């Protein structure tokens, strides 16, 4: 689920 | 709406092999699905347009195939820049729609943490808080134990994890383990200890301070 | 060379209204169109409209209601505004042109806009320094007790950034974020370089540079 902080998927 | 399933969520790999990205659609589509890239704090990047036709600036190792309704982004020989998510989208049907995305690790060598231990600055303290900071530097894996001593007592609740994406270059992480405490509590104190239990140490690594030196 | 440049990362209140402006270069507006795409934690990515070359503009089913694009070719934005935000509508959202004026490859997008849809007021961080203290001088900053995200960190204006790991914020039981910023450097510079983190937090207009040095 994406990460708003990273932009990545946790 | 066209449903895209892509598969597996997560995928592990090592620098120079093969990998390969499914994204199923809910039904034909054709060869109307583009890939994207999205690398750590970025936004979205265009890899390849209807199903296998190349892009302007991306590297030959990106290519695609598929037809119908199972398609496949695959990269030849991963990089460790290759680290990121990487989505599929539809314009067979309307509206667009894109998958839910593959996230991309890479494997590595073990790498033993570098610990430093940061006190407080005279600064923060006038808020009335403290922050002891640890910081875990360049390790690998991912799995890594933070334990907090303050006078010998174990720690436990007051403690916050924050750790980085892996790094494009050498696919290590680093991670920070902040100890928050009241200025009255860090004051009745004198020895903060930060013990790192990891992989690549054949013994937990402490690094502490006595509170003034 | 393409570029599409978003306005300021944004609070909004709950169901209030959420403004973008798009400001584009290397092209004209007149000849492609600007899609607009959102990014969430519950939805992914999510395609919610585009405006045409012609002026025309299309929505996404689901917000067809609330959703509004506009724009201005002489001035070379387009603006975005969507009506009634909520916790759900928390994302961050992208101004996007495709390869050729009427498709939907995306290849060239904004930095993104990270939107906070929350009651909470606004905060500007406290930065702190990470004093340091095999040849090698660990030092940083922390950037303590703001909302909302985000806060963009660099050091030495930009000319510093090997070996510099700015870790993700984690969000505090008071409601407030928190990061750090650190960096590895040679211990026998830290009597020659100064090191120098350039905090920001727009939401705020926070503008700190803190300097770290050995204590």
């Known amino acids: 689920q994406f990460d708003l902080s990273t932009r990545r998927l946790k | 709406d066209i449903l895209l399933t892509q598969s597996p969520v997560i995928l592990s790999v090592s620098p120079g092999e093969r990998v390969s990205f499914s994204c199923r659609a809910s039904?034909?589509?054709?060869?109307?699905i583009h890939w994207y890239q999205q690398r750590t704090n970025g936004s979205p990047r265009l890899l390849i347009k209807?199903?296998?036709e190349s892009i302007s600036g991306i590297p030959s190792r990106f290519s695609g195939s598929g037809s119908g309704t199972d398609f496949t982004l695959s990269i030849n020989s991963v990089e460790s820049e290759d680290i990121a998510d990487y989505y599929c989208?539809?314009?067979?049907?309307?509206?667009?729609?894109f998958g839910a995305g593959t996230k991309l690790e890479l494997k590595r060598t073990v790498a033993a943490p570098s610990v430093f231990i940061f006190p407080p600055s005279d600064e923060q303290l006038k808020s009335g808080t403290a922050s002891v900071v640890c910081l875990l530097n360049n390790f690998y894996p991912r799995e890594a134990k933070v334990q907090w001593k303050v006078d010998n007592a174990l720690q436990s609740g007051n403690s916050q994890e924050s750790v980085t994406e892996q790094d494009s270059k050498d696919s290590t992480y680093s991670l920070s383990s902040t100890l928050t405490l009241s200025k009255a509590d860090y004051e009745k104190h004198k020895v903060y200890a930060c013990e790192v239990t990891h992989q690549g140490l054949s013994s937990p690594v402490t690094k502490s301070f006595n509170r003034g030196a | 060379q393409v570029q599409l440049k978003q306005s300021g990362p944004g609070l909004v209140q709950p169901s209030q209204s959420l403004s973008i402006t798009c400001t584009v270069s290397?092209?004209?507006?007149?000849?492609?169109?600007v899609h607009w795409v959102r990014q969430s934690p519950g939805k992914g990515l999510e395609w919610l409209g585009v405006?045409?070359?012609?002026?025309?503009?299309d929505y996404n089913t689901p917000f067809t209601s609330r959703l509004s694009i506009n724009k201005d070719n002489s001035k070379s934005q387009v603006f975005f505004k969507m009506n009634s935000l909520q916790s759900n509508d928390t994302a961050i959202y992208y101004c996007?042109?495709?390869?050729?004026?009427?498709?939907?490859?995306?290849?060239?997008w904004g930095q993104g806009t990270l939107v906070t849809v929350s009651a909470a007021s606004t905060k500007g961080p406290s930065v702190f320094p990470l004093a340091p203290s095999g040849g090698t001088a660990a030092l940083g900053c922390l950037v303590k007790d703001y909302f909302p995200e985000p806060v963009t960190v660099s050091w030495n204006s930009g000319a510093l950034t090997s070996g510099v790991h700015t870790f993700p914020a984690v969000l505090q039981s008071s409601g407030l974020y928190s990061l750090s910023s650190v960096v590895t450097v040679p211990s026998s510079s830290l009597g020659t370089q100064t090191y120098i983190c350039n905090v920001n937090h727009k939401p705020s207009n926070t503008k700190v540079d803190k300097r770290v040095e050995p204590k």
């Open positions: 405006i045409w070359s012609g002026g025309n503009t």
């Open positions: 039904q034909s589509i054709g060869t109307n």
């Open positions: 996007a042109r495709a390869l050729t004026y009427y498709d939907y490859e995306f290849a060239y």
């Open positions: 290397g092209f004209s507006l007149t000849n492609y169109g």
């Open positions: 989208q539809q314009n067979n049907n309307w509206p667009t729609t």
């Open positions: 209807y199903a296998s």
